[PDB]
């Protein structure tokens, strides 16, 4: 046997989804990106191969069906007739094995044509490569070739911005760079000119809101429906959470499958991919117990973003990241691979948490989260596998959060430099590790993870909340004011207070009970002002 | 712009009939509560503090009717009100001759022992009495004439019925 | 024209411009590039406009539209975002440009580096809301606001580009209105109604004599004159172009923030990190249009103004080549190590690379022994509002708030004006000191009349022509601008095979993509540019192409490349609209032949 | 299905339109000049009522032009001193002189629209405060709630040998009221 491997992948997903700064269209574009390499893949497969993958998809509303060899047969050994086997389908990526080159071409034609028709503006293409099963590892290299040749051919492929070209006499879209082509209704219900791109996104937001709600009946369908069901909300939080290490595993998975045989590679690769989708869903259905005033926006693969009740999002995200680890610990299909990859039988995820007032733009809040997620994701290189080479991340879960108020600067770089008031002094400890210390103890960078442990923040918040107040707000704010001075003046104020309020022995960080700061890589850093920020954003139904 | 049938400049001398204390953020190393000072360091009445003094009084006069209050003092949330029609400027305080600020000592007396309660020892800088400052008021009228509620306010000012600053019950304002 | 100023004397403590707060402040005032407080020119225009609207509304006997409201739309321009339905006339621009009011330049210099003093210009004002029944502070309603000390005298440059035909009576009407509305202005900024922001606003040269004239004459005043564009006039008299090509390098320095629209989407404009040459075509028409027909030269392709890209190594920074790939964990040009030219270097073991995607690289010789210097363009977001005039606060009906990214002040850019020898003869026969006329200060960009767009342009000496090497083995191409090839159907949906065919035809050499499997051969990205044409009153068409930085390298299969022709194509550019700066190529550059993975950065 | 496209090189716009006149009957046209983007209609014979003086290049003249009707579109763009390339796009194979024929196969044509600038203020006028007025060659009058659209067809074809489809062109058809 020899076959071909087809890779179909949606390019530019961040651009396509977040280009219009318009929440219905971000939801709409995320669903188009999902549908293109699932729904439309399965129809395109079914037209080119006369198969029934779309029936199994629409019966199930889930991808787990194609792990069954009865529903997705093994191409190898000629006992089975199946000329197609889907190795992967997911948001923006799909992989399939086919035995005929002409059908490999026709599949990519069919899927990419249907994207042009039903998903304008979606950049999606495909590649196929030879797949030699006389090599016991041939499939794994075929995957790596397809990814290589896909990157190369995209540059010569025609770009998805080369259509809907503006004419001088054409009108402009209300929400896009593109010319207007259709009408739609703004959030106030006025008719407005929109592009065919924006129009098809908004059309799809209906199918998206369905599918996201279908994950759990407790979920709210719409941000409008939060505004209906939950008028009590004083705050809202975009959560963005991203799974860690899967790309480096998949780049290396030949090592981790065990038996160096193609049939095992496919099975391990497929099941691992499905397993992370289930872990994200299951971890999410666990975490929402903290609330349901939560609207999902994207929920699949190792990737989650949702709009929470504000002042429940640090707790929802702590609980989610604890449950994402707990899921990937117990989930057999991840367990053994993570053990061989990183020496512990779990994966990890991190979260950015904007926390926003309800009328504030989601777009600004989400771009903050895309910066917060990078700040949480700095654990990737401060907590690292001991004696690794290259220096792999040790699986570690962390949060960064803001609480905009609008006052801090809406840009993350400016936000943090207003909390570094003096060259050695910074008033934030805010990348907080949420992984348990016991799990971290075998990594390098353990000592850093403890200083950045979220429990240190949650404890200090508890001392602030504990009670008349044990630490008076009157005196907390005296200290808050002093923190913007030099340490010699912050410590002076604290020394005026430290023995009038014995609870302050817990808020110290020096190890001496005379300063709120601790030294970290030459910077005086403190959690005290983070604890004042989060004092009312650490609430839970548990 | 905003239409203005008639603009009114309402001005006169406000005299401290008792000492006064509008506070700044608080504490000048001579007093635990320190007077508010402008950017030139001169003692002044913030126009915010006088606006809320006059709006507050008017709120009691008009039985806490939001409608007529917001008709004259504006509203952030009504779709037809927005900015205020009464402008209140910051007014510098002229302490008579050049008398310095007084410092006033305060103590809480423990109700059991009859003696100064521990910690409850404080001091407040207060503007003397006789001190003068401008009434810096402007009113943009869209109606004809001048509102009755605004005439009532100016009557209360001449009656000395409005109180300003801290410690209004404890001697001041 | 120049010479008018607005003088602003702040007579109470003042707050302006920002919906953000610092550590102990929940509202922070706006601060210039010196970190000193200033009155933005959009705030100053909006305040002064409002006060002129009051004067006109009085002179109109309270009519919301009328003769004197026409005069406000004359002086300050129509507001097309308010009007709705079939408004037939094109929107008038303003006759008045009003800069940002900055602190005295010598006072500003005294502050430099004295961070503690810059903070001391402003102080916390307390703010609390009292409960009407209890007489005590409401919960939540405690704020601390930054306010700037009274006594600040700020001055803004003003320009009145009055029409050439405007009568002396109509000039005195404009002076009267502006002098009137300035004197009627008593407040600016935030919390004007509660003390803040009291001011004196004076024009230089508009005394009350200008108000007194209006008082004596306002009844005699007609409608404003009709607005018309300054249309272009072509002599057609230019010579044919003749080699050589002169290159006149123009340094551009940003003196106020410049908005150069990349993506205009909703309530935000994003900014380019370079000045397109089309922005300088107006300055070229001004300074040089008396010497030759600039419009005919543009039509004939006898004129190029390149993009002004950030100055690096004393030259124009070059768009980072997409053939450069950094180590995803611990490399790239921002780290200063671990950069591989994938046209020449294999991907290392274990480490996966990511492409470089932006910024500008400096100069690089064939034996640089260092990574090229990387220039970064600083840009800041500025946020504005529109006030609905009857409620005197932003509302949804007026769109509320909008933002511009802008290239901040103090940035230095290099463009080059290229002209054929025949035009340089033509110019020099009419002015021997003609490069001295290229010194100008001009406004370019979006919003160029108020707070944005002020740039100094200064010419250098005539630069050397490019010196591409005519390597017969391989040819590489580096895109230093955005290439706009048309397909064979004249739409812009060209492909890399169209570029191969184009260069093959231009250089008379056959090309084939190089097959070395560890090495990448093509590293393009596409670009789509959306722009307005001010002379059309309509958007330009949409220009699709490849981004600056895109790279490719070919094996030369047959023929021999001519370095004379490579040079010619390195001056004129390739494809559409090269006169604006598109099409700018780099041929056989060292940085695309080099192997970099072993190299590192340097009162 | 074939998209037929006809090339002629080093041809003036005045001559390019005159060569196509049999096909550009009643065709709407858009002319790009340094100072104006003017909309024009060719008469039923495919002629312009001032074609030389309108289509000349010499003095701030037209550097790019498009003409379209139901059956075809002519495109022209200047390349040297008022000579340019002409490309005519047609659904049907047709006879032209001097033009060179070619074609490309397309999988399917999908209609698109493009809302024009303005509300209703032979020839009709749209206007918008943003731009002022826009005059459009349109014979039926416009009701106040009408909006004028421009229709096009995009032709999808395989670009890569891996079968990746893309829209290889978009031909303009007509103005239409919706």
């Amino acid at each position: 046997f020899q076959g071909f491997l087809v890779l179909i992948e949606t390019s530019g997903n961040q651009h396509f989804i977040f280009s219009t700064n318009k929440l219905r269209e971000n939801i709409g574009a995320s669903e188009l990106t999902y549908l293109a390499t699932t729904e439309i893949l399965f129809q395109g497969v079914d037209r080119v191969f006369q198969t029934n993958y779309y029936d199994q998809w629409s019966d199930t509303n889930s991808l787990n069906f194609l792990a069954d060899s009865k529903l997705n047969p093994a191409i190898d050994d000629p006992k089975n007739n199946a000329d197609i086997e889907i190795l992967l389908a997911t948001s923006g990526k799909a992989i399939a094995l086919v035995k005929e080159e002409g059908k490999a071409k026709q599949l990519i034609k069919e899927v990419t044509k249907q994207a042009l028709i039903n998903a304008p503006g979606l950049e999606i293409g495909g590649i196929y490569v030879n797949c030699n099963w006389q090599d016991k590892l041939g499939v794994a290299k075929a995957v790596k070739e397809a990814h290589k040749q896909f990157e190369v051919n995209r540059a010569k492929r025609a770009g998805a911005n080369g259509r809907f070209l503006r004419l001088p006499i054409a009108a402009g879209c209300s929400v896009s760079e593109l010319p207007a082509s259709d009408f739609d209704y703004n959030a106030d219900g006025d008719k407005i000119p929109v592009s065919t791109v924006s129009k098809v996104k908004r059309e799809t937001a209906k199918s998206a809101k369905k599918r996201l709600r279908s994950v759990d009946g407790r979920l709210v369908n719409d941000l409008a429906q939060l505004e209906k069901s939950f008028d009590e909300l004083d705050w809202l939080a975009v959560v963005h959470a991203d799974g860690n290490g899967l790309g480096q595993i998949l780049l290396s998975l030949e090592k981790y499958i065990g038996e160096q045989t193609n049939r095992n590679y496919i099975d391990k690769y497929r099941r691992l991919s499905l397993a992370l989708d289930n872990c994200t869903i299951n971890a999410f259905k666990m975490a929402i117990a903290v609330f349901l005033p939560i609207v999902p926006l994207i929920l699949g693969g190792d990737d989650l973003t949702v709009i929470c009740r504000g002042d429940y999002a640090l707790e929802f995200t702590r609980e989610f990241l604890e449950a994402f680890e707990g899921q990937t610990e117990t989930h057999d299909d991840i367990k053994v691979i993570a053990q061989k990859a990183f020496g512990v039988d779990r994966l990890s995820a991190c979260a950015g948490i904007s926390i926003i007032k309800p009328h504030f733009p989601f777009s600004v809040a989400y771009t903050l989260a895309e910066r917060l997620i990078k700040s949480a994701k700095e654990v990737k290189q401060k907590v690292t596998v001991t004696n690794s080479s290259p220096i792999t991340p040790f699986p570690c879960s962390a949060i960064d959060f803001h609480i905009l108020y609008d006052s801090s600067g809406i840009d993350f770089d400016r936000i943090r430099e207003k909390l570094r008031p003096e060259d050695n002094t910074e008033l934030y400890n805010r990348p907080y590790v949420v992984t348990a210390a016991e799990n971290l103890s075998q990594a390098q960078g353990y000592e850093w993870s403890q200083a950045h442990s979220l429990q240190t923040l949650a404890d200090r918040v508890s001392y602030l909340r504990s009670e008349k107040s044990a630490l008076p707000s009157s005196q907390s704010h005296a200290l808050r004011t002093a923190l913007y001075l030099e340490k010699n003046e912050a410590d002076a104020q604290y020394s005026l207070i430290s023995q009038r309020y014995k609870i302050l022995k817990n808020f110290a960080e020096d190890g001496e009970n005379k300063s709120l700061f601790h030294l970290e890589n030459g910077k005086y850093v403190t959690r005290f002002l983070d604890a004042l920020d989060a004092k009312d954003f650490f609430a839970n139904a548990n | 712009a905003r239409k203005v049938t008639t603009r009114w400049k309402i001005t006169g001398t406000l005299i401290a009939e008792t000492p006064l204390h509008i506070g700044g953020v608080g504490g000048d190393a001579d007093t635990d509560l320190a007077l508010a000072v402008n950017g030139a360091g001169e003692y002044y009445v913030p126009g915010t503090s006088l606006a809320g003094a006059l709006r507050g009084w008017m709120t009691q006069l008009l039985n806490n009717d939001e409608s007529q209050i917001k008709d004259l003092w504006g509203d952030h949330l009504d779709a037809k009100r927005g900015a205020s029609f009464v402008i209140v400027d910051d007014a510098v305080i002229h302490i008579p001759n050049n008398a310095d600020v007084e410092i006033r000592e305060g103590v809480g007396i423990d109700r059991h022992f009859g003696t100064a309660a521990n910690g409850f020892k404080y001091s407040r800088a207060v503007i003397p009495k006789g001190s003068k400052f401008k009434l810096p008021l402007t009113f943009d009228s869209q109606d004809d004439g001048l509102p009755n509620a605004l005439i009532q306010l100016l009557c209360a000012l001449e009656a000395g019925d409005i109180r300003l600053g801290a410690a209004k019950t404890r001697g001041l304002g | 024209m120049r010479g008018i100023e607005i003088t602003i004397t702040m007579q109470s403590d003042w707050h302006v411009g920002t919906g953000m707060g610092r550590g102990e402040l929940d509202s922070v005032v706006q601060r210039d590039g010196d970190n000193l407080p200033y009155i933005p020119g959009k705030t100053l225009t909006g305040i002064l406009r409002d006060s002129c609207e009051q004067v006109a509304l009085g002179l109109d006997n309270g009519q919301t539209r009328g003769l004197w409201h026409g005069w406000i739309n004359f002086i300050f321009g129509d507001q097309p975002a308010l009007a709705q339905g079939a408004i037939e006339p094109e929107p008038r621009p303003a006759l008045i440009a009003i800069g940002s009011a900055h602190l005295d330049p010598k006072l500003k210099a005294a502050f430099q580096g004295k961070k503690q003093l810059q903070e001391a210009i402003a102080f916390m004002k307390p703010g609390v809301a009292i409960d009407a029944i209890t007489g005590t502070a409401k919960k939540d309603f405690l704020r601390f606001e930054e306010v700037v000390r009274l006594g600040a005298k700020l001055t803004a440059e003003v320009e009145l580009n009055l029409p050439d035909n405007l009568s002396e009576t109509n000039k005195k009407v404009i002076a009267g209105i502006l002098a009137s509305g300035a004197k009627l202005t008593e407040r600016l900024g935030g919390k004007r109604r509660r003390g803040n922001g009291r001011c004196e606003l004076k024009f230089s040269g508009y005394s009350d004599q200008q108000i007194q004239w209006l008082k004596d004459n306002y009844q005699s005043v007609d409608q404003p004159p009709k607005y018309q564009q300054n249309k272009l006039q072509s002599a057609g008299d230019n010579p044919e172009q003749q080699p050589p090509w002169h290159i006149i390098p123009l340094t551009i320095k940003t003196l106020s923030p410049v908005v150069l629209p990349a993506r205009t989407v909703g309530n935000v404009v994003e900014c380019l990190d370079y000045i397109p040459g089309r922005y300088l075509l107006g300055y070229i028409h001004k300074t040089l249009g008396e010497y030759f027909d600039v419009s005919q030269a543009i039509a004939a392709g006898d004129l190029i103004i390149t993009n002004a890209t950030i100055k690096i190594d004393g030259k124009a920074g070059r768009a980072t080549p997409f053939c450069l790939f950094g180590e995803k964990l611990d490399g790239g040009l921002g780290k200063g190590k671990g950069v591989y030219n994938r046209f020449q270097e294999s991907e290392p073991d274990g480490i996966q690379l990511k492409g470089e995607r932006g910024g500008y690289v400096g100069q690089f010789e064939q034996e640089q022994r260092n990574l090229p210097n990387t220039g970064k363009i600083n840009s800041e977001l500025f946020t504005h509002n529109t006030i609905q005039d009857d409620v005197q606060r932003p509302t949804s009906d007026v769109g509320g708030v909008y933002s511009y990214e802008a290239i901040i002040a103090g940035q230095t850019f290099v463009a080059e004006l290229r002209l054929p020898d025949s035009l340089v003869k033509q110019i020099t026969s009419k002015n021997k000191n003609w490069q001295a006329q290229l010194k100008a200060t001009i406004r370019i960009g979006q919003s160029k009349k108020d707070q944005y767009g002020k740039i100094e342009v200064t010419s250098g000496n005539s630069a050397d022509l490019p010196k591409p090497t005519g390597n017969n083995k391989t040819l590489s191409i580096w895109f230093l601008s955005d290439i706009l090839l048309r397909g064979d159907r004249l739409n812009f949906n060209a492909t890399p095979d169209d570029l191969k065919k184009y260069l093959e035809n231009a250089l008379d050499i056959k090309l084939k993509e190089r097959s070395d499997n560890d090495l990448i051969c093509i590293a393009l990205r596409s670009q789509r540019t959306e722009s307005w044409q001010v002379r059309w009153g309509l958007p330009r068409p949409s220009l699709v192409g490849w981004q600056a930085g895109s790279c490719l390298i070919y094996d030369i299969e047959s023929g021999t490349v001519n370095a004379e022709k490579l040079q010619e194509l390195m001056i004129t550019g390739i494809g559409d609209r090269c006169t604006e700066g598109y099409g700018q190529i780099g041929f056989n550059d060292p940085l695309l032949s080099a192997s970099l993975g072993k190299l590192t950065a340097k009162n | 299905k074939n998209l037929y496209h006809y090339h002629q090189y080093e041809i003036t716009l005045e001559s390019a339109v005159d060569s196509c006149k049999n096909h550009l009957q009643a065709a709407i046209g858009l002319l790009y000049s340094p100072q104006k983007c003017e909309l024009v209609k060719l008469d039923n014979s495919g002629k312009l009522v001032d074609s030389y003086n309108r289509l000349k290049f010499n003095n701030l003249g037209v550097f790019e032009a498009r003409f379209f009707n139901l059956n075809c579109e002519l495109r022209w763009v200047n390349e040297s001193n008022g000579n340019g390339t002409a490309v005519l796009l047609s659904e049907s194979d047709i006879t032209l002189t001097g033009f060179e024929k070619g074609l490309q196969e397309f999988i399917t044509a999908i209609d698109q629209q493009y809302l024009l600038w303005g509300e209703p203020a032979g020839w009709q006028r749209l206007a918008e405060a943003r731009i002022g007025k826009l005059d459009i060659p349109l014979d039926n009058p416009l009701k106040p709630k009408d909006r004028v659209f421009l229709t096009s067809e995009e032709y999808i074809a395989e670009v890569d040998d891996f079968g990746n489809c893309a829209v290889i062109d978009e031909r303009l058809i007509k103005l239409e009221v919706k």
Side-chain angles (χ1 to χ4, degrees), chain A residues 19 161 163-164 407 418 484, chain C residues 19-21 23 263 380 513 528:
Chain A
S19 46
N161 59 6
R163 68 184 290 216
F164 313 110
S407 113
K418 311 223 299 194
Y484 301 106
Chain C
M20 85 186 34
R263 276 205 318 156
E380 189 54 80
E513 62 193 307
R528 175 166 158 158

Side-chain angles (χ1 to χ4, degrees), chain A residues 288-456:
Chain A
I288 64 177
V290 304
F291 297 108
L292 275 39
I294 189 273
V295 169
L297 309 178
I298 305 186
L299 179 56
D302 60 334
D303 187 357
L304 178 143
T305 170
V306 307
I307 306 177
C308 311
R309 196 183 189 293
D311 74 66
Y312 281 69
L314 308 186
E315 310 90 310
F316 163 69
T317 49
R318 191 216 87 256
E319 195 121 338
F320 175 72
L321 293 180
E322 287 168 359
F324 183 89
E325 289 183 324
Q327 283 288 315
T328 60
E329 281 171 16
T330 54
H331 205 304
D332 190 357
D333 305 335
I334 295 169
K335 190 182 195 300
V336 298
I337 297 177
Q339 181 60 54
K340 289 181 169 69
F342 313 125
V344 291
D345 60 344
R346 79 185 211 295
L347 298 180
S348 283
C350 54
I353 317 173
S354 310
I355 298 161
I356 237 84
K357 299 205 294 185
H359 294 264
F360 186 96
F362 165 75
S363 51
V364 177
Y366 182 80
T367 188
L368 234 177
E370 287 269 53
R371 267 90 284 284
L372 270 25
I373 189 68
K374 292 178 68 182
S375 312
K377 197 152 56 170
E378 85 181 45
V379 297
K380 182 173 63 176
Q381 291 290 280
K382 284 192 179 170
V383 191
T384 50
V385 176
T386 309
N387 311 334
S388 59
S389 284
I391 301 173
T392 52
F394 185 82
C396 182
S397 301
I399 284 173
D400 200 332
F401 71 92
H402 180 43
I403 313 155
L404 204 28
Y405 289 114
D406 203 28
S407 113
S408 305
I410 74 256
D411 180 7
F412 178 84
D413 193 6
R414 284 68 171 198
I415 282 165
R416 294 288 153 102
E417 61 118 10
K418 311 223 299 194
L419 286 173
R420 194 180 304 122
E422 293 300 337
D423 303 22
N424 72 356
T425 287
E426 73 195 344
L427 309 187
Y428 66 92
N429 197 106
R430 213 163 294 195
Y432 285 103
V433 178
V434 325
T435 302
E438 285 74 14
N439 297 128
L440 294 156
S441 65
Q442 67 191 94
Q444 295 166 340
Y446 176 56
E447 74 300 295
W448 177 89
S449 311
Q450 293 313 110
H452 280 274
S453 280
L454 183 61
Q455 190 62 51
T456 67

Side-chain angles (χ1 to χ4, degrees), chain D residues 96-109:
Chain D
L96 285 159
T97 58
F99 278 88
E100 173 182 33
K101 182 167 69 187
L103 64 101
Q104 187 165 18
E105 299 166 288
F106 67 81
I107 295 158
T108 185

Side-chain angles (χ1 to χ4, degrees), chain C residues 88 232 489 491 493 536, chain D residues 33 35 75 104 125 168-169:
Chain C
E88 286 186 66
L232 293 164
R489 306 177 192 102
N491 50 2
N493 69 353
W536 289 4
Chain D
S33 157
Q35 284 236 262
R75 294 175 193 149
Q104 187 165 18
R125 182 171 294 168
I168 53 158
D169 204 274

Side-chain angles (χ1 to χ4, degrees), chain C residues 79-91 229-236 240 264 293 295-296 299-300 486-493 495 532-533 535-539 541 576-577, chain D residues 3 5 7 31-37 57-60 63-64 75-79 81 85-87 89 103-104 117 119-121 125-134 159 167-170:
Chain C
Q79 307 185 94
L82 302 187
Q84 66 186 1
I87 285 72
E88 286 186 66
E90 300 92 325
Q229 296 179 17
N230 294 299
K231 291 208 183 150
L232 293 164
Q233 292 177 335
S234 161
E240 291 296 339
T264 306
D293 188 342
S295 76
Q296 184 184 21
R486 295 173 184 261
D488 57 340
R489 306 177 192 102
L490 304 177
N491 50 2
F492 287 104
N493 69 353
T495 67
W532 197 268
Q533 173 144 0
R535 303 194 186 278
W536 289 4
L538 290 175
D576 214 53
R577 291 174 224 247
Chain D
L3 173 64
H5 51 77
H7 308 262
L31 313 175
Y32 301 164
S33 157
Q35 284 236 262
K36 39 183 183 171
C37 180
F57 184 76
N58 300 73
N59 296 328
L60 306 137
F63 62 79
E64 169 165 19
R75 294 175 193 149
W76 178 93
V77 53
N78 174 72
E79 292 177 350
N81 201 39
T85 294
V87 182
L89 295 95
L103 64 101
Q104 187 165 18
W117 285 111
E119 303 187 52
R125 182 171 294 168
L126 309 176
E128 200 166 312
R130 190 173 176 165
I131 62 170
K133 47 166 242 55
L134 174 62
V159 173
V167 300
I168 53 158
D169 204 274
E170 182 180 7

Side-chain angles (χ1 to χ4, degrees), chain B:
Chain B
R2 181 184 260 187
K3 194 167 181 176
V4 178
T5 285
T6 290
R7 174 171 286 173
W8 292 87
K9 294 230 185 161
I10 298 140
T11 195
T13 300
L14 292 168
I15 310 88
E17 291 301 331
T18 60
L20 254 169
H21 182 94
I22 301 77
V25 184
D28 287 345
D30 288 345
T31 58
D32 304 303
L33 299 119
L35 289 164
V37 292
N38 69 5
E42 303 168 300
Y43 300 118
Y44 87 133
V45 185
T48 47
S49 72
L50 183 63
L54 304 183
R55 176 175 183 151
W57 183 92
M58 260 183 56
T59 304
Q60 297 294 83
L61 170 79
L62 304 177
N63 314 309
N64 317 78
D65 173 33
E66 305 92 339
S67 64
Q68 287 163 101
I69 296 295
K70 296 174 170 202
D71 288 354
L72 282 99
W73 298 94
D75 192 22
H76 50 319
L77 309 163
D78 186 22
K80 295 188 178 180
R81 275 184 276 218
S84 175
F85 289 87
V86 193
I87 300 140
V88 201
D89 301 305
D90 291 340
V92 162
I93 299 171
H94 303 298
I95 311 194
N97 68 97
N98 293 300
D100 184 29
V101 174
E102 293 177 350
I103 292 82
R104 277 280 185 85
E105 297 293 330
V107 76
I109 300 299
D110 188 295
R111 301 298 192 245
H112 185 244
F113 303 99
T115 67
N118 289 337
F120 293 88
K121 174 67 254 287
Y122 65 93
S123 62
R124 186 185 296 278
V126 307
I127 293 280
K129 154 180 174 164
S131 302
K132 297 181 177 176
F133 60 103
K134 187 173 179 171
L135 176 66
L137 290 174
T138 329
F139 178 66
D140 283 314
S141 201
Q142 297 200 318
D143 42 309
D144 197 11
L146 190 69
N148 185 288
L150 189 50
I151 295 167
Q152 294 289 352
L153 180 78
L154 295 169
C155 293
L157 286 171
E158 288 208 317
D161 289 344
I162 303 190
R163 295 208 179 207
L164 184 67
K168 287 178 292 302
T169 60
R170 327 183 289 260
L172 270 45

